[PDB]
């Protein structure tokens, strides 16, 4: 009931290990620990035979491009989570940071494996020949530009966009497409394991991000000002435009049976809005009813392909 006249912020350095000022951190690290997985657990022989014999060119190309798109984010040094303790110098945030950073290396190794297995290393090296990918790199570079900023307001902006776009949305259309092959045609089961496990991880990273944004809300409510909220709204809008066009490239050899572009676009718009609600920001798209239930099977399939 009694608010403190003064207190240390999330940006100040607590030196003693415990007790944790932000104990909820452990919900996120324990969820990752519990879901722990590596790609070496998985053999893709069945999936390659499925690919070889039973997928059309349109389908093969959807799989290939969805994986190139995931790899574009995942097969990289992703230094954000490893860097958060530099901004929030708490023992608990070193633990969250380190936990999510190690997870992202399990990710990079997993998608690197799928590229070698499916024979797409050449296409990955030249991926910047695709116009829409170069535009994805641009919107990603705008999210990431204030990642290492000493200016805390700007960094907070990077974090918001990092969490709602890169962790919560940018990959999820590709995840859905790959999962559709298993849900609707029983093919690519092992690939869908990797994807389901990554989906679970990325949701936890996004929610961890959201937790941190909400703590900054409480301590520095002045930060969520008019310009900043509008700066976020606009960047999101643009980003969704690029990811819609990513779909057009993924399905370049034609539309397929197991999933449709329009459903995916409303799936993305929807999950953006939900993430916005969760950090008390006004919705952008306001999707339906009943569009976004086209892909309401997503979570069920994710839960199912985690074994």
């Amino acid at each position: 009931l009694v608010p403190r006249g003064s207190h240390m912020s999330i940006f100040d350095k607590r030196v003693n290990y415990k007790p944790f000022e932000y104990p909820e951190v452990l919900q996120f690290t324990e969820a990752i620990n519990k879901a722990y997985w590596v790609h070496t657990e998985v053999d893709f022989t069945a999936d390659t035979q499925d690919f070889h014999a039973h997928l059309s060119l349109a389908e093969k190309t959807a799989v290939k491009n969805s994986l190139l798109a995931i790899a574009q984010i995942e097969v990289a040094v992703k230094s954000f989570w490893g860097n958060i303790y530099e901004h929030f110098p708490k023992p608990e945030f070193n633990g969250l940071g380190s936990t999510f950073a190690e997870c992202e290396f399990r990710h990079s190794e997993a998608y690197s494996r799928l590229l070698e297995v499916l024979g797409y290393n050449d296409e990955f090296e030249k991926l910047l020949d695709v116009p829409v990918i170069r535009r994805r790199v641009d919107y990603l570079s705008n999210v990431l530009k204030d990642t290492k900023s000493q200016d805390n307001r700007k960094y907070m902006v990077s974090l918001i966009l990092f969490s709602i776009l890169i962790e919560n949305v940018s990959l999820f259309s590709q995840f859905a497409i790959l999962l559709s092959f298993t849900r609707f045609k029983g093919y690519m089961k092992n690939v869908s394991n990797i994807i389901a496990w990554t989906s679970i991880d990325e949701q936890i990273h996004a929610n961890g991000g959201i937790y941190i944004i909400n703590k900054i809300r409480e301590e520095f409510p002045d930060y969520f000002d008019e310009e900043t909220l509008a700066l976020v709204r606009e960047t999101v809008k643009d980003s969704i435009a690029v990811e819609s066009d990513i779909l057009d490239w993924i399905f370049e050899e034609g539309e397929i049976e197991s999933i449709k572009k329009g459903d995916l676009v409303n799936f993305m718009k929807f999950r953006i809005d939900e993430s916005l609600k969760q950090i008390n920001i006004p919705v952008i798209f306001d999707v339906k009813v009943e569009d976004y239930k086209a892909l309401a099977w997503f979570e069920e399939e994710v839960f199912a392909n985690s074994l």
Partner: peptide, 6 residues
């Protein structure tokens, strides 16, 4: 700022 708290 560096500090302790229990």
């Amino acid at each position: 700022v560096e500090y302790t708290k229990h």
